[PDB]
Amino acid sequence: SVHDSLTHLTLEIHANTRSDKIPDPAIDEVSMIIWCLEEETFPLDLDIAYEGIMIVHKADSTFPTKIQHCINEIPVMFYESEFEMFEALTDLVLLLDPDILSG
Amino acid sequence: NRWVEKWLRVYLKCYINLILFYRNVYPPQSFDYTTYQSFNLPQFVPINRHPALIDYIEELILDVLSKLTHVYRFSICIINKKNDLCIEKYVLDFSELQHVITETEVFDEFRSSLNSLIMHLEKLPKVNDDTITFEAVINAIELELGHKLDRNRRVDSLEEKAEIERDSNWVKCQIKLTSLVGSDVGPLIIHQFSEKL
Amino acid sequence: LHMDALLTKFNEDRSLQDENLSQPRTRVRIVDDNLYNKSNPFQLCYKKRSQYYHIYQYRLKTFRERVLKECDKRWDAGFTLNGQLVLKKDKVLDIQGNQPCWCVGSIYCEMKYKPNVLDEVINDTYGAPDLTKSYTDKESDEIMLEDESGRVLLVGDFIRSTPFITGVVVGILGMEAEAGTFQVLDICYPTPLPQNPFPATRGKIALVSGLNLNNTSPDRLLRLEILREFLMGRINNKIDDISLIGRLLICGNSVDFDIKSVNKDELMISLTEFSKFLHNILPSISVDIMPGTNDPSDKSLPQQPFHKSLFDKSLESYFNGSNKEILNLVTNPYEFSYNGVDVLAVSGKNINDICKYVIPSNDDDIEHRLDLMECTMKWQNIAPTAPDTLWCYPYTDKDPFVLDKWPHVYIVANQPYFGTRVVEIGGKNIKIISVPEFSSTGMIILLDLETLEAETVKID
Numbered sequence: 001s002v003h004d005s006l007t008h009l010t011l012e013i014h015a016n017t018r019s020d021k022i023p024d025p026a027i028d029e030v031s032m033i034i035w036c037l038e039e040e041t042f043p044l045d046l047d048i049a050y051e052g053i054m055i056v057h058k059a060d061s062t063f064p065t066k067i068q069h070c071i072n073e074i075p076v077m078f079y080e081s082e083f084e085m086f087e088a089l090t091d092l093v094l095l096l097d098p099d100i101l102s103g
Numbered sequence: 104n105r106w107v108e109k110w111l112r113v114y115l116k117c118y119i120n121l122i123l124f125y126r127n128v129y130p131p132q133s134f135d136y137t138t139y140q141s142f143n144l145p146q147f148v149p150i151n152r153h154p155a156l157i158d159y160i161e162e163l164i165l166d167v168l169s170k171l172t173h174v175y176r177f178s179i180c181i182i183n184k185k186n187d188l189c190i191e192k193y194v195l196d197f198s199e200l201q202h203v204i205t206e207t208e209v210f211d212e213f214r215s216s217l218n219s220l221i222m223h224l225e226k227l228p229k230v231n232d233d234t235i236t237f238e239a240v241i242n243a244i245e246l247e248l249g250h251k252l253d254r255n256r257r258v259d260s261l262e263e264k265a266e267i268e269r270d271s272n273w274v275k276c277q278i279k280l281t282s283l284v285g286s287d288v289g290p291l292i293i294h295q296f297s298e299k300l
Numbered sequence: 301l302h303m304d305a306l307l308t309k310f311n312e313d314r315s316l317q318d319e320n321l322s323q324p325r326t327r328v329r330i331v332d333d334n335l336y337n338k339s340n341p342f343q344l345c346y347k348k349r350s351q352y353y354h355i356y357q358y359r360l361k362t363f364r365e366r367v368l369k370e371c372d373k374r375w376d377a378g379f380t381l382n383g384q385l386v387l388k389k390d391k392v393l394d395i396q397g398n399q400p401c402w403c404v405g406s407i408y409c410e411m412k413y414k415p416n417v418l419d420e421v422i423n424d425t426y427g428a429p430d431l432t433k434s435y436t437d438k439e440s441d442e443i444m445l446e447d448e449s450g451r452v453l454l455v456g457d458f459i460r461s462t463p464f465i466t467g468v469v470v471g472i473l474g475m476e477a478e479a480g481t482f483q484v485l486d487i488c489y490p491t492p493l494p495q496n497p498f499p500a501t502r503g504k505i506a507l508v509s510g511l512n513l514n515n516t517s518p519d520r521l522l523r524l525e526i527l528r529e530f531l532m533g534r535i536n537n538k539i540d541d542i543s544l545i546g547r548l549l550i551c552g553n554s555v556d557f558d559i560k561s562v563n564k565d566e567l568m569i570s571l572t573e574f575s576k577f578l579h580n581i582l583p584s585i586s587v588d589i590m591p592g593t594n595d596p597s598d599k600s601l602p603q604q605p606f607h608k609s610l611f612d613k614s615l616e617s618y619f620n621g622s623n624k625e626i627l628n629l630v631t632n633p634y635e636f637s638y639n640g641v642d643v644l645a646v647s648g649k650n651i652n653d654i655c656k657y658v659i660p661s662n663d664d665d666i667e668h669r670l671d672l673m674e675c676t677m678k679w680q681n682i683a684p685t686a687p688d689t690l691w692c693y694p695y696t697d698k699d700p701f702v703l704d705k706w707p708h709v710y711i712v713a714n715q716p717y718f719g720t721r722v723v724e725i726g727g728k729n730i731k732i733i734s735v736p737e738f739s740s741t742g743m744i745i746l747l748d749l750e751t752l753e754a755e756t757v758k759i760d
Contacts (some may be wrong), residue, residue: 015581062449069451138515139566147518
């Protein structure tokens with residue numbers, strides 16, 4: 001009935017490398033942002049689906065629909081650059097306000 | 104001894120298998136009609152599929168073939184356990200054994216002998232389970248077992264151990280006779296006999 | 301009546317005529333013209349020996365071109381619907397509107413694997429994970445059309461009463477109703493292949509499969525001897541009707557063992573047991589040997605013939621290369637031109653592997669196998685399941701399993717039951733025949749060459 005635990009959150013990151021060079025944060029860019037929320041501890045039951053996938057796309061008119069139809073379970077949001085993706089991730093973190101970050 | 108060893112081996116194997124099957128000494132469900140038991144058998148005979156009985160009969164036949172140089176008679180006894188009395192006696196003669204070709208002819212002779220044995224066994228009444236067991240008796244010409252351990256038999260390989268365990272596994276001991284057809288081939292001159300009551 | 305009465309009525313009334321034994325009746329001559337002509341299609345080089353993707357691409361391109369030609373021949377311009385006009389679309393993402401359209405694209409379904417084969421393979425991998433978790437972790441039953449640009453849920457009623465397997469190219473034409481789900485009104489199939497003309501004295505062919513001569517089943521040898529005596533004209537005694545069987549066709553499964561635990565002795569014994577039967581049947585009726593899935597040959601579909609060895613030394617007179625019409629060892633698939641009649645025979649590994657899966661749609665009976673065979677004949681693809689049936693490097697730029705000429709009779713073996721079906725596709729005529737095993741219910745199929753009528757012969 002009352003909250004007696006801590007919220008939990010995780011995140012994964014995929015980056016495109018060049019012939020399996022162990023992608024480095026100095027020259028390799030991020031392409032996908034996958035996060036999951038533990039629905040067991042989370043309170044207030046908001047409309048967030050406890051999951052989300054963010055994919056960058058410079059915009060050709062078929063990739064977003066293809067990914068949406070391939071997923072068909074979790075809503076996917078697209079952005080035009082990595083800075084917008086980071087801003088959206090920060091906004092999501094501020095909206096949910098998790099007390100624990102994992103990885 | 105070059106090729107008659109395997110032929111006599113498979114003949115004794117089929118003999119023991121048919122004797123054990125047709126006399127209900129073991130459950131028939133444990134037997135299966137086959138043709139290969141590590142050796143090409145001349146007929147679809149019912150061979151058991153139990154490990155202990157397998158190497159039991161294997162060692163028995165090996166000892167018999169090793170002692171064949173002095174054995175002239177091999178008998179398989181069938182006795183009851185409630186009373187140590189011989190009920191059936193199946194004799195296999197080895198008169199001179201024609202000791203020191205056309206394997207198909209040897210297989211045909213063995214098949215004829217096994218068919219005669221099956222025909223003879225089919226006329227006997229049904230035998231019940233529950234301790235109707237079997238034994239083994241042999242008759243040699245001139246030999247003495249059970250006395251090779253007078254020097255502690257210091258072993259060095261597997262052949263000496265096998266010889267010792269074979270010479271030490273024997274103990275000395277002391278109606279309607281029905282003859283059957285044997286093997287009239289040159290190298291394998293074998294005769295067959297049988298006893299009842 | 302008793303058996304004695306029938307014996308006294310039959311044996312005493314024996315004619316004992318026509319058995320001259322000096323001027324015997326000659327068997328009807330039946331020659332397979334495909335023996336030495338050219339272009340053995342399924343004959344590959346074992347020394348030559350992933351290429352699966354390369355094959356997939358060529359197959360998809362050929363199928364797409366054929367489907368496009370069929371659409372041009374059927375859905376050509378001016379083929380208006382009831383109220384709306386019909387249109388064409390190049391990409392799968394282009395069909396979005398209240399108008400009907402026709403498009404080409406592959407079909408994608410679930411096609412789950414059977415649980416029996418799952419544990420059967422699991423028991424021989426030395427520490428594999430629970431494959432049952434791979435199917436149960438996911439939340440299934442839906443048919444979609446992929447055209448390299450997207451997927452659309454093909455909801456409808458005409459798809460329900462039709463069998464499908466992933467990888468088939470279909471040119472269905474429909475129209476969306478309320479979402480990204482395209483309906484279906486008609487279903488298109490690729491263009492019909494050219495078929496040789498049926499020829500206008502005539503003999504029959506005996507087809508037998510599923511012998512499975514093993515060292516444990518003795519009833520198989522008795523049935524084999526009975527079949528050898530009946531084909532020799534000694535049992536039926538009607539030489540006027542038995543002499544019409546020109547040759548016998550062994551489709552597969554002559555020797556059955558478990559390759560896990562076998563030695564050279566058992567295989568040699570089984571081959572010599574077969575060799576006898578062969579030596580008794582050869583000088584009376586020709587024979588056509590075909591391998592199978594449990595035969596000592598390759599496990600893939602295009603199996604080479606067994607060998608020149610693995611038979612008795614007394615058969616060396618037949619393996620001299622000159623007497624080929626008497627005994628012919630051929631690959632697993634073959635298109636025999638028996639006196640101008642083109643018949644295709646397969647060991648049945650394709651249908652058995654297709655049935656080895658569990659598809660959660662399309663609503664093991666005789667009708668199901670017949671429908672699967674009809675679909676295989678229509679799709680012009682003998683092997684629908686590539687990795688389970690086909691092996692690496694099957695061909696270069698020209699797959700043999702894709703049908704190029706429709707035959708007259710499609711013969712499949714190694715099936716539990718027997719049946720026949722005459723299908724009409726594009727004005728053509730194909731007769732599918734299901735050959736059962738000879739071990740259990742050892743029926744003999746007699747196929748005529750004058751009217752394509754198949755008869756059965758039971759042996760107990």
